[PDB]
């Protein structure tokens, strides 16, 4: 049988600045529908060696990546008309190991938690201007 392998997370050099359970969606423009992308912890990670910031999220049970993209100053968290606890934004995502331009949205448990994320996300964006 295959031998046991080193467990590699890709986060060994990183520090969690934020982690909150959310439901992630991805807009399918072909059919003009939001599609569930996963359920799990959406994290803001800071790489302690080079200082880079990224979004990272894995799906629960299957444990597969559903969000993996650098935070940029260009990203603009926007509300959705149908929710009081969700934001949408555009990102070049690397979940599947290939860069993909994706229209994403995340729904939080409460509006307070969504506001908390937006404040933390935009604090990070401002630090990038420095």
């Amino acid at each position: 049988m295959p031998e046991k392998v080193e467990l590699v997370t890709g986060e060994e050099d990183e520090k969690v600045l934020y982690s909150q359970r959310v439901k992630l969606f991805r807009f399918d423009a072909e059919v003009s529908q939001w599609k569930e992308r996963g359920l799990g912890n959406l994290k803001i990670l800071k790489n302690e060696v080079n200082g880079k910031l990224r979004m990272l999220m894995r799906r629960e049970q299957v444990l597969k990546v559903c969000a993996n993209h650098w935070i940029t100053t260009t990203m603009n968290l926007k509300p959705l008309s149908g929710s009081d606890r969700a934001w949408m934004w555009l990102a070049s995502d690397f979940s599947d190991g290939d860069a993909k331009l994706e229209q994403l949205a995340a729904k939080f448990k409460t509006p307070e938690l969504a506001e908390e994320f937006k404040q933390k996300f935009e604090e990070c964006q401002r630090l990038l201007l420095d």
């Binding site: 003009s32 939001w34 559903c66 260009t74 008309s81």
Partner: protein, 207 residues
């Protein structure tokens, strides 16, 4: 030198086979019933403490209009999932036929039995009625593609049987650093306009 396994996914039409596969692939939940025509092979990779394993899932058409020689799609199979719907007694009544057809072609392959749609309260196939797995020594699971209840267990169990390690674990997928290429502001603005409808399109979870 990838560790692959052919997996045949069978069951009466409407039991949720394709919805189950799509859920695993993209995380989506398709609400529409578009009957599968023919056979569609989908690779599904899981990360284990012994490395990644790939299930080439053969999603089949449950309807008997497509059953003239369905045996041929079971050749070289290494495992299988039989799926039925707990809100439709007929789907469970036909499980023995699905199991019979499989073993006739593939003999001793690991096979998991899945009662899908357990999220619905009006369960027409009761838990005490489900006995066929005891009879044949199969692994059974209540699953829900809609609630994700136990929806990874069939693959975890099959992975342990096929690899021969009852302590196999599914582990976090490695998340490598994205490339330096990101959306330039102009392209980002171009897509904010093209995809503006997304801002006024309801989330499906709002249900």
């Amino acid at each position: 030198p990838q560790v692959q396994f052919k997996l045949v996914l069978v069951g009466d039409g409407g039991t949720g086979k394709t919805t189950f596969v799509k859920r695993h692939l993209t995380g989506e939940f398709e609400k529409k019933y578009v009957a599968t025509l023919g056979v569609e092979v989908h690779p599904l990779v899981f990360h284990t403490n012994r490395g990644p394993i790939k299930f080439n899932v053969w999603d089949t058409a449950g309807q008997e209009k497509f059953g003239g020689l369905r045996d041929g799609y079971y050749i070289q199979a290494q495992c299988a999932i039989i799926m039925f719907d707990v809100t439709s007694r007929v789907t469970y009544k036909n499980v023995p036929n699905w199991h019979r057809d499989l073993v006739r072609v593939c003999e001793n392959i690991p096979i998991v039995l899945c009662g899908n749609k357990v999220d619905i309260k009006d369960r027409k196939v009761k838990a005490k009625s489900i006995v066929f797995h005891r009879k044949k020594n199969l692994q059974y699971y209540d699953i829900s593609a809609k609630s994700n209840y136990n929806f990874e267990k069939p693959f975890l169990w099959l992975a342990r049987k096929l690899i021969g390690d009852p302590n196999l674990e599914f582990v976090a997928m490695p998340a490598l650093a994205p490339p330096e290429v990101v959306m330039d502001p102009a392209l980002a603005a171009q897509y904010e306009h093209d995809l503006e409808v997304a801002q006024t399109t309801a989330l499906p979870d709002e249900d």
